[PDB]
Amino acid sequence: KLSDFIGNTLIVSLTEDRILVGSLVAVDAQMNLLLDHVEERMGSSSRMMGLVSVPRRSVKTIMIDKPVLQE
Amino acid sequence: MLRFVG
Amino acid sequence: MEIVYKPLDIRNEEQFASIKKLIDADLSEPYSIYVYRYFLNQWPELTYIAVDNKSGTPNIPIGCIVCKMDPHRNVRLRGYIGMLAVESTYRGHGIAKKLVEIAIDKMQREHCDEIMLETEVENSAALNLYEGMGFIRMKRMFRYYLNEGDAFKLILPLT
Amino acid sequence: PMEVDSILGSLSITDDFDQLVDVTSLFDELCSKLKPEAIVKDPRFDLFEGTHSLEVNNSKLDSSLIELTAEEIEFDVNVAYDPPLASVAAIADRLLRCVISWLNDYQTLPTTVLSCRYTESLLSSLVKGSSWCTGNILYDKVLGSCILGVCYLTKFVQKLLSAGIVFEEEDLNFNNMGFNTFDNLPGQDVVINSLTESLQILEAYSDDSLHLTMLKHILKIIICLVHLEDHLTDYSTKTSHLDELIENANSVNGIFPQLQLSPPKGAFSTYIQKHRSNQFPPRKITKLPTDYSGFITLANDVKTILLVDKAESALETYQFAKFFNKLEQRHVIARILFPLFFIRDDRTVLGKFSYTQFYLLHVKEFSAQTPGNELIQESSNMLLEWYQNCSQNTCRYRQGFNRQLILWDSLQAQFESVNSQVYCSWTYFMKLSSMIEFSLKGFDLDIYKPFEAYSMFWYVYYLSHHLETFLKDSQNDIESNINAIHSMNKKLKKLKAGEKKDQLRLKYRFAMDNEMEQLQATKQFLNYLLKEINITKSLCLIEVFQFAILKSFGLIDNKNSTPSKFSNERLIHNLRFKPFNSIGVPELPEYEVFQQTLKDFVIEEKGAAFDIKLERATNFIETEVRNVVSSIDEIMQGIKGGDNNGVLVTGTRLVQELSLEYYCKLKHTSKALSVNSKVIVNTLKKNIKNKDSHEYKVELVHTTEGWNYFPIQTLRIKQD
Ligand SMILES: CC(C)(COP(=O)(O)OP(=O)(O)OC[C@H]1O[C@@H](n2cnc3c(N)ncnc32)[C@H](O)[C@@H]1OP(=O)(O)O)[C@@H](O)C(=O)NCCC(=O)NCCS
Ligand SMILES: [Cl-]
Ligand SMILES: [Cl-]
Ligand SMILES: [Cl-]
Ligand SMILES: [Cl-]
Ligand SMILES: [Cl-]
Ligand SMILES: [Cl-]
Structure with a gap:
């Protein structure tokens, strides 16, 4: 379910070039995501941001590593 | 007003 | 102007979005969705909105107040007012005062022993509202807010 | 892209x-x-x-969405921007003023010191193991040493905040953005030699413009700033580099108007908040100070801290902690340094006494009685925490007492059960003095509303009476022991040589050598305490009388005048005096005693009978102010004279200027209360006569050059 996804690393693609790598902490009914240990990657650059919440309108793609998905 | 804290 | 006071409807998306946009512009401390999500989803009975029935969009709330309650220490229930905001075009009409009355009345019916909030010492408008209702200052916090202003901790004792 | x-x-x-x-x-x-x-x-x-949590696409909460100018976006640290001398001097100037904004103005570290691209470049190389090479000596050597010297000062500040002396991100912000230089940062001598080498280059340098002269002072200022760690590592009490810092900062302040400085664009920016790991919302850069007056404030604040080393008694350290941070809030560096300089690593106070011996000196100098106990061990810890609370900011200073009042009370009651009269007495003095200080500090913070002025001023007057009673009894016992020794002297002149006289002369000489000096000193110290506490008692009674006059005309009340629907006046009152609820001696007066005492003060009469009682109350305020002024003048005299005149002992040798300044402001406030009392009377009498009467309200106004523990209850028209 949506429950098992909690605590598992996910990849979130925003509208711009930057991509957020973090662990899903929580999800609400409007699919707003709360991610901890967020790593932001802008092309070649990468940086940490901690606990971040992303609104639904900011999410362009939600990717998960297929092994971790099947795990 | 609640204050934001890291 | 025909101001109507009603509790927050948790399923309504527009009420949620209007509250957040209202609070974000008027309040200086920034809040994410999960700040509002912590208050509204756990204490949906402790948030009230003020709408204008004769307005161009009656559904949109021009004022709101966001509260919570938890046991303080072990033996007392402490109500807490997190956010309060009124549209600039609707200020000076007693709307905020009514929102604070209905919320404190709600928290009192829920057997709160005290009400607590933090406000800027430079925010004379808010101080007059609460202190006029019985709130007193119990603490001054040095540069409590992001704008580097000091804060007063206001407490209203109910029991 | x-x-x-x-x-x-x-x-x-x-x-x-x-x-x-x-x-x-x-x-x-x-x-x-x-x-x-x-x-x-x-x-x-x-x-x-x-x-x-932070939120993406939230302008207030997203670091990535920050907007940068083209110059800020690139700005390679390896480019030598023209003109090199003007830009290096302007870069080095802004960096120093970024440090002042960070420490003096309590600004954040990322928007001040880390805002410089050069400092980021240097620290990143230190994290691995100068950092930039531009081909120009001014940027490569002269500027490289300036950045190294400032990064060394930040690491020293981290060592101070590691002690937890002051609260983080309130008195001082240290957001290092994950930086850890470990042991890679060079030592103090290496940093100093780098700055010294850069100064020698400038002397040889050909360009003689004003920028060179200012760059020399900037190198010299950083040198004297690096010497700040000498007061902690070696407990240095020498003002040599603190005076050079003042002379260097004085020379730069007169240089700012003659030349205009603008660093290369993009040198100082929010770039680091955008491309470095940051778990905090974006923040604009606050306007930096225009001069170097911060370093003079810092250097003067540290000079004051080191003065506590020169103390020779417990009372001298006691008054130092009572005055060094009372008039205004000291520099955060100096406030951290005092407990670390006072409570040293070797578990000794100033390197002279152990924690228990330092506690015993306070009891001895207060009781004038010669003394591994667990109660003594615990009281010693309590006394050191009391000293450390004095160096907190003006808000935390009051909050520290809220915790002490119940541990002093419990400790005193523990001394009472074992019937230890001397320690119970001294703990009672610290407990009762803190209750008065805790209460009166709320006026300085505008904690109490004008309707609460009577409750708090009368309660302090209630407390001050009990403290004067206690101190007077202590002084009578002290004088009683002195008269006993004086009696042996008279008994010796009427005696002849014999075995019974030899016993008395041996008894008398013992008391004179081991007891009389302390008895006189403690007595004279108690004489000052009695004058100090009657000034408190009088001022409180003046405030209560002023309140009572205001309520007599119907302008104020000891409860909230606005109608509320959720609370009552008794609940609000019990919440105000909640901190004093569990303290047994002196017991908190009941809500009924507060109400009855006020009704006794309020003039219930009308007409000519009112005029007589009103004149009686105003006559007291005017006469008592003059009595207060005279007591302050006598205290100020003893302060100027010293503790060897034979009447007053104040222990203010290390804080002489501050103490006279304190009582001077206390004198300013006293005269203001008398002037305000007369204005209130001439206004209300005329207002009553006029059928159209202004609607007045009372506000607790702070005297600009007075002591705000006793604000002025001032009338003001409401209007619209
Ligand atoms: C404070 C705020 C909500 C006021 O909204 P409002 O609807 O105009 O307030 P009200 O009309 O209900 O005023 C009721 C009482 O509050 C006080 N009050 C409101 N505005 C005031 C002002 N400029 N000055 C002094 N007191 C004021 C008055 O005591 C007033 O009593 P009165 O009616 O007898 O004169 C609005 O200005 C605002 O959004 N401020 C920024 C957010 C904020 O203040 N948050 C507080 C921390 S939770
Ligand atoms: Cl309702
Ligand atoms: Cl003492
Ligand atoms: Cl003494
Ligand atoms: Cl004992
Ligand atoms: Cl004290
Ligand atoms: Cl009331």
């Missing part, structure tokens, strides 16, 4: 993940099904932690 690196980087953004699957479609389907109020999260996880 147009940049080639961003194109090449996007190819390998997710290379560490072998296979990624689009679950955007699956998430939408499940979230639509879920109820609007439901939240999917680990049940053990608390939703309160989500309130500390």
